[PDB]
Amino acid sequence: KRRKSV
Amino acid sequence: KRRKSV
Amino acid sequence: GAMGSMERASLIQKAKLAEQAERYEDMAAFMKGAVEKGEELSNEERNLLSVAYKNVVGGQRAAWRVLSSIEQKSNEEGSEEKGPEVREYREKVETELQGVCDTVLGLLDSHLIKEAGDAESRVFYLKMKGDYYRYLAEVATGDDKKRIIDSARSAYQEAMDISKKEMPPTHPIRLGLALNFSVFHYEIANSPEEAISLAKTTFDEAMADLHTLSEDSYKDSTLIMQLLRDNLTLWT
Amino acid sequence: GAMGSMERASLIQKAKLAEQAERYEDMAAFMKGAVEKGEELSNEERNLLSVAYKNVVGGQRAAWRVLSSIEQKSNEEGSEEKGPEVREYREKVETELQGVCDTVLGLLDSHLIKEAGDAESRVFYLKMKGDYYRYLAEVATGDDKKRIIDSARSAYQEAMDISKKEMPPTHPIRLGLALNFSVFHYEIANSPEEAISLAKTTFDEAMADLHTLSEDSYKDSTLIMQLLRDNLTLWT
Numbered sequence: 001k002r003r004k005s006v
Numbered sequence: 007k008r009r010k011s012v
Numbered sequence: 013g014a015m016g017s018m019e020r021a022s023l024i025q026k027a028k029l030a031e032q033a034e035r036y037e038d039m040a041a042f043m044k045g046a047v048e049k050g051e052e053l054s055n056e057e058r059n060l061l062s063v064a065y066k067n068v069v070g071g072q073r074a075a076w077r078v079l080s081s082i083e084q085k086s087n088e089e090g091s092e093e094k095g096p097e098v099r100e101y102r103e104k105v106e107t108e109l110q111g112v113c114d115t116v117l118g119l120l121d122s123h124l125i126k127e128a129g130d131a132e133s134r135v136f137y138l139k140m141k142g143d144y145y146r147y148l149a150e151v152a153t154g155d156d157k158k159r160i161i162d163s164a165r166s167a168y169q170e171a172m173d174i175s176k177k178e179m180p181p182t183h184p185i186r187l188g189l190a191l192n193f194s195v196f197h198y199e200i201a202n203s204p205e206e207a208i209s210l211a212k213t214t215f216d217e218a219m220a221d222l223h224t225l226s227e228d229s230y231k232d233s234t235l236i237m238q239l240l241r242d243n244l245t246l247w248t
Numbered sequence: 249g250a251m252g253s254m255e256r257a258s259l260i261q262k263a264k265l266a267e268q269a270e271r272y273e274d275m276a277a278f279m280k281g282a283v284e285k286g287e288e289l290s291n292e293e294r295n296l297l298s299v300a301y302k303n304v305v306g307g308q309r310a311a312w313r314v315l316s317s318i319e320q321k322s323n324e325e326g327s328e329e330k331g332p333e334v335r336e337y338r339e340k341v342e343t344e345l346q347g348v349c350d351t352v353l354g355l356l357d358s359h360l361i362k363e364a365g366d367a368e369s370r371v372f373y374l375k376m377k378g379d380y381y382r383y384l385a386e387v388a389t390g391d392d393k394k395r396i397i398d399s400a401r402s403a404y405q406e407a408m409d410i411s412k413k414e415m416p417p418t419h420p421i422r423l424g425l426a427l428n429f430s431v432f433h434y435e436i437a438n439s440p441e442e443a444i445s446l447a448k449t450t451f452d453e454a455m456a457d458l459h460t461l462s463e464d465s466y467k468d469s470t471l472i473m474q475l476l477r478d479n480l481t482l483w484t
């Protein structure tokens with residue numbers, strides 16, 4: 001759903 | 007698991 | 013002081029936004045500013061006040077319990093001495109928690125309780141006064157612990173007595189008060205029997221009054237009655 | 249200033265406790281105090297610093313997006329004028345968010361970056377510098393928005409160049425930098441093609457290096473590679 005960042 | 011309060 | 017220059021209605025509007033944003037510290041400060049306007053709160057404003065502090069203090073309590081458990085494990089036979097940090101940091105969290113409880117109890121005493129003449133407002137505020145003395149009791153260990161507990165007990169008891177005279181057995185505030193007073197019995201006053209009897213009698217009396225309700229009131233009351241049932245299941 | 253009188257090791261010990269308690273604001277203040285001791289951070293301390301601010305700022309970003317969406321809906325044709333509160337409260341949250349980003353960027357510039365000579369420290373700090381300029385860019389609307397974006401780009405680019413020369417394609421920091429730089433391309437610099445190419449090339453180069461790893465390193469790298477894959481799936 002929401003793009004991933006880390 | 008943990009008793010309920012409100 | 014800090015919300016002194018904002019309109020009451022603006023602080024209310026902002027508390028609702030902060031709720032939506034899950035910014036409960038903000039929500040709580042906005043509602044404190046709204047109470048400090050000196051006017052009585054409506055039903056919906058009382059709910060905003062209680063949800064804001066409930067969430068703030070609920071986060072502090074959970075943190076304090078994580079830290080208390082660590083602290084206790086460090087005091088066990090065979091544990092390596094890791095110095096004072098756990099105890100210091102638990103004390104910091106604990107002090108901030110006590111400050112929140114004192115602030116809520118301060119708003120109640122100045123001057124929400126004394127101007128609350130309807131059952132639904134007065135029982136609501138006395139329940140909150142019992143809750144915040146109860147959160148105080150959860151962390152109390154000194155000379156005043158008995159007085160803290162009895163202040164929780166007394167506030168819940170006056171709320172119970174008014175709710176029994178003035179509200180139907182199914183009223184959500186009556187039901188939530190009894191749920192919390194029964195938790196107080198169970199884990200603060202070391203009276204698990206009273207805790208169980210109160211939750212049982214409360215549940216049973218609510219059941220027999222369900223028939224008087226609309227479908228929406230039914231939903232509201234049974235939601236709380238399930239929390240009473242969950243506790244009875246856990247405790248028996 | 250505020251953590252000036254606490255031992256470095258105590259602040260570290262307390263950051264780890266605050267993490268356990270999910271008290272990320274506390275965790276972040278403890279790690280700020282630890283950085284301000286002036287000594288370089290170890291690998292594990294860099295991770296504590298980054299997790300603390302990541303969580304603090306991640307809560308503010310989520311709140312800002314809830315509030316920005318409300319604000320935008322209030323500016324739609326046919327909406328009732330509800331005055332300035334939504335915009336005021338969004339601006340408050342936004343200002344606090346910018347303050348956190350400025351504080352992290354301040355720690356990086358004074359003096360983490362300049363003393364970081366190993367690849368793993370220097371790429372880690374430059375990635376964080378790109379991240380915090382990126383969070384700045386997410387809320388920027390004025391005269392400096394282009395410069396903010398380019399500061400994010402430049403920091404990510406120098407991190408990329410060092411990571412490509414000095415680290416294996418599977419290194420978690422190299423992988424996390426590329427994930428975030430690809431997000432920057434996609435939603436900040438309006439370059440979805442660059443975003444996709446970067447995530448794809450990064451994933452593919454990591455795949456071909458998996459064979460060099462132990463089982464634990466394998467686990468660490470594939471965990472990040474999946475986040476690259478999740479983005480490619482969403483974006484294509």
Ligand SMILES: COC[C@H]1CC[C@@H]2/C1=C\[C@]1(C)C(=C(C(C)C)C[C@@H]1O)[C@@H](O)[C@H](O)[C@@H]2C
Binds near residue numbers: 063139188
């Ligand atoms: C002072 O103690 C307030 C506490 C007593 C029971 C319940 C309370 C709080 C909030 C505001 C509500 C619920 C739910 C049961 C929906 C959880 C919310 O925290 C209201 O909807 C209920 O009508 C009711 C007032």
Ligand SMILES: COC[C@H]1CC[C@@H]2/C1=C\[C@]1(C)C(=C(C(C)C)C[C@@H]1O)[C@@H](O)[C@H](O)[C@@H]2C
Binds near residue numbers: 471
């Ligand atoms: C500066 O950007 C740091 C960011 C780049 C990738 C990843 C980062 C943060 C943290 C500390 C880790 C993970 C997971 C992948 C476990 C999420 C955590 O936030 C570390 O375990 C990784 O080794 C690695 C350093």
Ligand SMILES: [Mg+2]
Binds near residue numbers: 019020
């Ligand atoms: Mg006015």
Ligand SMILES: [Mg+2]
Binds near residue numbers: 090091092
């Ligand atoms: Mg030993």
Ligand SMILES: [Mg+2]
Binds near residue numbers: 128
């Ligand atoms: Mg009155």
Ligand SMILES: [Mg+2]
Binds near residue numbers: 255256
């Ligand atoms: Mg020292």
Ligand SMILES: [Mg+2]
Binds near residue numbers: 326328
């Ligand atoms: Mg209209």
Ligand SMILES: [Mg+2]
Binds near residue numbers: 365366
């Ligand atoms: Mg060095």
